[PDB]
Design a protein around this ligand. Structure first.
Ligand SMILES: CCCCCCCCCCCCCCCC(=O)O
Length: 265
């Protein structure tokens, strides 16, 4: 229907406006200011001097490479949280929710959305970083000292299967909106209204996938399962972050992310 197709287009346009990275932009870069390839410590350190110069301007006081990398991971998440917060305003009913419910939905949804969207910048060999200006290899990330080598690999595993679904930005935008609209998040004040907001977005997602992916009759339930898989990926990620927090004193957690993780798992 015109209203439902228009809603899907709205959410797609809001996604293109609000996220610095989209799947088309990522694919243009990945196909070959080209991205600097980070595949070892030499190339990490060269990339840092150009792309995150302040982080390595401290001489012998610079942090360990793994800690610098984790800091850059967190800065990326902080920026994506800001983008997701603006995007959520395009979702029918979201801005009409109580301010506290908006906070709760974003708190529990952002990392699920982050890992879903991260797939768009990942291939089997590595991922784009730093606003598309670096490509860091999967093998380099696996080579880091424990526990830091354990951060990205499960996200690559998720992404390879997610990317095999061959979603486009029009699908991913609605999937991210659906992640944000979960009525079963803890602490919600108006569950009923959130459930109806969820039902509306999920209806739009179902119809859109039927229209955009006529070849895959299971795509909607596949994506419902991916949402559950993302919840488990995030719980596991939070457990690893808590290990880092307890055992890696140099790996300072950004305060916005500390609040997101607080009282989550
Ligand atoms: C010189 C640039 C080095 C870049 C280092 C890798 C950046 C990865 C960005 C994606 C991070 C995904 C994981 C987020 C982790 C978290 O916020 O808890």
């Amino acid at each position: 229907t015109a209203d439902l197709k228009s809603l899907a287009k709205r959410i797609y346009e809001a996604y293109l406006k609000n996220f610095n990275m989209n799947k088309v932009k990522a694919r243009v870069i990945l196909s070959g200011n080209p991205p600097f390839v980070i595949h070892d410590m030499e190339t990490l350190c060269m990339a840092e001097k150009t792309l995150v110069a302040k982080l390595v301007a401290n001489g012998i006081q610079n942090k360990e490479a793994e800690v610098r990398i984790f800091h850059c991971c967190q800065c990326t998440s902080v920026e994506t949280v800001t983008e997701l917060t603006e995007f959520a305003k395009a979702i029918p009913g979201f801005a009409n929710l109580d301010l506290n419910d908006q906070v709760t939905l974003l708190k529990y949804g952002v990392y699920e959305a982050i890992f879903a969207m991260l797939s768009s910048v990942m291939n089997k060999d590595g991922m784009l970083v730093a606003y598309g200006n670096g490509f860091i290899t999967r093998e380099f990330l696996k080579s880091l000292r424990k526990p830091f080598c354990d951060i990205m690999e499960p996200k690559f595993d998720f992404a390879m299967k997610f990317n095999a679904l061959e979603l486009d930005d029009s699908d991913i935008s609605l999937f991210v909106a659906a992640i944000i609209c979960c009525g079963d998040r803890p602490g919600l004040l108006n569950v009923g209204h959130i459930e109806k907001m969820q039902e509306g977005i999920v209806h739009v997602l179902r119809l859109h996938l039927q229209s955009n992916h006529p070849d895959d009759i299971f795509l909607f339930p596949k994506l419902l399962q991916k949402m559950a898989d993302l919840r488990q990926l995030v719980t596991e990620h939070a457990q690893l972050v808590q290990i880092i927090k307890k055992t890696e004193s140099d790996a300072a957690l950004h305060p916005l992310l500390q609040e997101i993780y607080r009282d989550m798992y």
